[model samples]
Target: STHLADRYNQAWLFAARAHRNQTLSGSPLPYLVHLGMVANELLAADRDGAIERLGETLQIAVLHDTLEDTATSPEELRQQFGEFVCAGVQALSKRVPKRSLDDYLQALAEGPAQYALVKLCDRITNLQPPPQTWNQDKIANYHQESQLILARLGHAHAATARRLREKIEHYRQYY
Candidate 1:
């Protein structure tokens, strides 16, 4: 148990440094704040028995955006955290050059169910009021993306899916 907890802590620090200069897209808050929110959501769903591997799920949650948004690489993540967590983060990353957003989400949907939980929770965290700069179309498009995420990942965790559904409806106000 101690060993597992230690890994989570190390991942948190590693992810923080990876995102050091990054901030929330719509605000000045550190991007680590966003990673924490996704971790928290995964934690909550884990409480409901949605996660089969808590340690790896949390690690993936914290570092989910590292490949897509930071200077991190898959080899670095695998070296630091090993294959399972690294694979989870890879499935969640949207950084592949030839991969469209739909392709990325579809790829994620076909992977481990635990990764589905991570993706659903990440979107739930992001369903917040979008950046003030977002136009109506941008907001609408995000909402549609949320719908797609729900359709793809909602089966992974019933409780998390419920939470995401409520947030998605609430986000329609932005439209």
Candidate 2:
């Protein structure tokens, strides 16, 4: 049987393949770099004394974008990983068009607390410099949307929430 950490390894490789041709919006950076940053946030939280469940949270962090960004489906995730992970990934996915950002965020508030942490991590990674292609309004909207995320989901982990809030303030200075 594979060790638990090996499962996270598989998820990273799977995400790499799934995001093979993708790059960050308006940047030359690979999309996998974002995934890595999310994982780094989770690991950092753990190291900074956040309580954790098994290795599942780390696995969820690594693969959070797979369902939304890749061709990977919830069924495949369930089969390849397990129900908990599939659910976590699914909870992190944004159902755009079908749901307004307000609605989607409200729905996410209902998911496991782990999903909130994953999103906080994602936002922390995303708070870096705005893409050059984005207009001032778009950048401001991103920061505002990030503020909503922090307001709705930031309570899951205090330390990560503090980090995200600081990042949001720092990103605000760019515009």
lDDT leader: 1
How does each model score on TM-score?
0.94, 0.92
**lDDT for 36 (candidate 1):** 86
List pairs with backbone clashes in candidate 2: none
Top-TM-score structure, candidate number: 1
Per-residue lDDT of candidate 2, residues 68-131 (tens digit): 7789888888988789888988788774045677877777788778778888989999998988
Q: Write down the lDDT of every candidate, Cα atoms only.
A: 0.88, 0.84
lDDT per residue for candidate 1 within 1-175, as digits (tens), equals: 4475786798999998989989999899899989889988888888776467788888899999998888898999999888999999889877737478778878887889888889999999999889999999999999998999999789888999999999999999987
Off by over 4 Å in 2: 1-4
How does candidate 1 fare on TM-score? 0.94
**How many residue pairs clash in all the candidates, one count each?**
0, 0
